[PDB]
Each structure stands twice: as structure tokens, then as C-alpha cells.
Design a protein around this ligand. Sequence first.
Ligand code: PLP
Length: 228
Amino acid sequence: RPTVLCFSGLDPSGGAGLQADIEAIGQSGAHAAIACTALTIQNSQQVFGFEATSKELLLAQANAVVGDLPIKCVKSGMLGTTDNIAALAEFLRAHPDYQYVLDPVLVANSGGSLGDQATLVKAFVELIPLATLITPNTVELRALTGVTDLDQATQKLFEMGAKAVLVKGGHEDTPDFIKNSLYIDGELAASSTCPRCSLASFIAGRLALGDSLKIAVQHAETWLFGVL
Ligand SMILES: Cc1ncc(COP(=O)(O)O)c(C=O)c1O
């Protein structure tokens, strides 16, 4: 059972964060390991605050997993601080053989703060070229690039060094479905939907199990359509 190591925050209410990573990775067929980036204080309605994990304790968790478990993929969600973004980049550069799924979490779904967005956007520059796949929703895509046109923003992310981008949402969305577009090396590789879209951890698990990107993304949609 290949392992996905998740650099993710803890949401006590269990709606998001490393709990959702654990659930998705288990359903993908892989094993989840966790390097907790923050203990948040939040529920479905608001974020009250959070205590970011120090860079030292973050790397200590990650390094405890290294050597014990067969890490094949890293996934990141909430990182909280620019220190933790830098620590993850340091970790990834020490392990270029790991695949990496970057979910560029800038805000909570409730709207509450999971860190200062402007400085997080600037710090994410370092992680963009390291990712096997970046999974921005349309808000995250625009924030990372400073570009409001989705097509132009996607291309800008590739100019910034992205290798593959799964854009969640776009001009093809409807009340029943969010449309996802998988781009590889700047070119549209697969155009799909998703009934509703938190795909990064499930995709990471499928990548850990040896799937190609296209097959992993397809499995993730089948998983969500199976919930429906
Ligand atoms: C701690 C935390 N991580 C991540 C997310 C969103 O990413 P997922 O719910 O896919 O982990 C949220 C909420 O939006 C969150 O509060």
C-alpha cells in the first residue's frame, strides 16, 4: 500500500483539511500519512483562528514518515505560513522522486482566513514548478496568477513553471456539475465534469498507486459520481 504524505491543516469540525485527505486517500486505495501544518479553530460557519505548526515540527513529522513508509506522492493543502511553504519546498527538493499534488489553499470554504493571501500567493511561486499536478479552483487560479481571464491565467501558471494543472470550474459549469479541465504542458489533455470538488488527495492516492495523471483524474471523477 503506497503512501501519500499530506502537508495539511486540521479542521476540528471534520469538514475539510487532513480529515478529508484521510477519507479520500483511503477511498483511492492508498495509505495516508500526515504532516500537520496547523491546528485550526473553526467550524462549518467560520474560522476563529489557527496555530501554525513551526517549520521544525512540520519537518519532524514528515521526516518520521520518511524511511518507514513507502512515500510515493506528497499532497499539500493548507500550509498557513510562508515558513511552512518554504519547509515543504525544502522537503520536496530533498525528494525529487516523490510526486507532488499542490492544492493551493488560500482561504477556507467558509471564507475565513487560513493565512495572509498576498504573502501566500507570493510564496507559492516556489512550489508551482515542483508539482506533478496543481489543482486550483477558479479563484485560486486567478489569485496565483493575478489574471482574471481563465484561459490566460491557465497559460500564466504554465509560464510560472507548472507541469500540469487541473482547473476546477470554468465557463462550462452548470447547477449540477462543475467542469474540470486537465492541462499538461499548456495543452488541454482531458475535459471532464465533477458532480457538485476536492480531488487533490484522491488523485494523489491514485498517482501513488501508479496511475497516469489522466487515469488518476478519471478515477477521481468516477469516485465522486459513485457517491452520487
Ligand atoms: C484546514 C483546511 N484545509 C483545507 C480546506 C480546503 O481543502 P480540503 O477541504 O479539500 O482539504 C479547508 C476549507 O476550505 C480547510 O479549513
